[PDB]
From a paper:
Here, we show that a tyrosine phosphoregulatory system controls the biosynthesis and abundance of Vibrio exopolysaccharide (VPS), an essential biofilm component of the pathogen [name]. We found that the [name] tyrosine phosphatase controls VPS production through regulation of the VpsO phosphorylation state. Together, our data suggest that the phosphorylation state of the C-terminal tail of VpsO, modulated by autokinase and [name] phosphatase activity, regulates the functional state of VpsO to control VPS production and biofilm formation in [name].
[name] is a 166-amino-acid cytoplasmic protein containing the hallmark C(X)5R motif of the low-molecular-weight phosphotyrosine phosphatase (LMW-PTP) superfamily. We next determined the crystal structure of [name] at 2.2-Å resolution. The two molecules in the asymmetric unit form a domain-swapped dimer. The overall fold of each monomer is similar to that of other prokaryotic and eukaryotic LMW-PTPs. It contains a central four-stranded parallel β-sheet flanked by two α-helices on one side and three α-helices on the other side. [name] contains the same complement of active site residues as other prokaryotic LMW-PTPs including the nucleophilic cysteine (C12) and the tyrosine (Y127) that stacks with the substrate phosphotyrosine. In the crystal, domain swapping in the dimer occurs through exchange of the C-terminal α-helix (α5). Although size-exclusion chromatography data were consistent with dimerization, we cannot be sure that domain swapping also occurs in solution. In a steady-state kinetic analysis of the wild-type activity, we measured the KM to be 0.9 ± 0.1 mM and the kcat to be 1.4 ± 0.1 min-1. These findings suggest that [name] has phosphotyrosine phosphatase activity and that cysteine 12 is necessary for catalytic activity. Collectively, these results show that [name] dephosphorylates VpsO in vitro.
Numbering used by the authors:
A (entry chain B): 5 to 154
B (entry chain A): 5 to 153
Write the structure that this text describes.
Amino acid sequence: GLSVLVVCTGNLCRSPMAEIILRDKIRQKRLNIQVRSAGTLKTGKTMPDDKALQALQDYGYHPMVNPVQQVTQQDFIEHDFIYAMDRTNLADLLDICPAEHKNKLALFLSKANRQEKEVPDPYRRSSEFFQRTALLIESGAVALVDSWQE
Amino acid sequence: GLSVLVVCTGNLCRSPMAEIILRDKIRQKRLNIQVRSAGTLKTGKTMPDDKALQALQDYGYHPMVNPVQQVTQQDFIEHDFIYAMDRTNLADLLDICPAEHKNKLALFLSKANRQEKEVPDPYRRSSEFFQRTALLIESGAVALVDSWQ
């Protein structure tokens, strides 16, 4: 059958989510297409992010998940199409994709008739908000320390 | 000396961040104040969240960290002040604080002269964003399935 690979930076959130969702919709439509996911960067992790998996459960998907893996050279040959979650992902694959297979590269959102062209990284968004929390807590802490000396 | 407790739901993010930041500011002025943190809800976890700690490092704090712990009744007697990061925390504390000690309870931001009176939960925001991330991915997936068939 057909072979599809989905790729984000760490294979921790976005691309594993797409794999699980694609697999399900493929099985609903009884298509003979298999799907995997991979990251551009070697992470130390074994399994995808728990918060990715819980969001899939909230929407009725069963997250039975493959181990995290980084993209390889054989992936560009063995797979029929390969989808990138954001432009940075698409660039790094093109950076290392031999010219014979570069037409197989595309952004994940390319067939959805929507304004959004990249799916943004939830992890960077997460970090931004934790950094924002720190600043608010810092402001609170300074006031408490003042009040205490009074 | 003075003893201060700061409290969130899981003792994973807001309250340990506050403990570490408070400890730094107390030691900067060599005040005789101790600070600890605790959660209203018993989770199984041992240490706070990695991204709470990294966010502290990003701002130059050195996160030396106590194990996660749940608030106890001894906490309401042993501590001089007890701060809830948000109203949900303050409500859960009022539920189990003996009436003799409820005057020790206050919102963490009660002395910051700001609009914000609650520190919003980064975990709930994060969860919201993963859900909207999934929906964007799902709509993408549906389109991909169509073009193939």
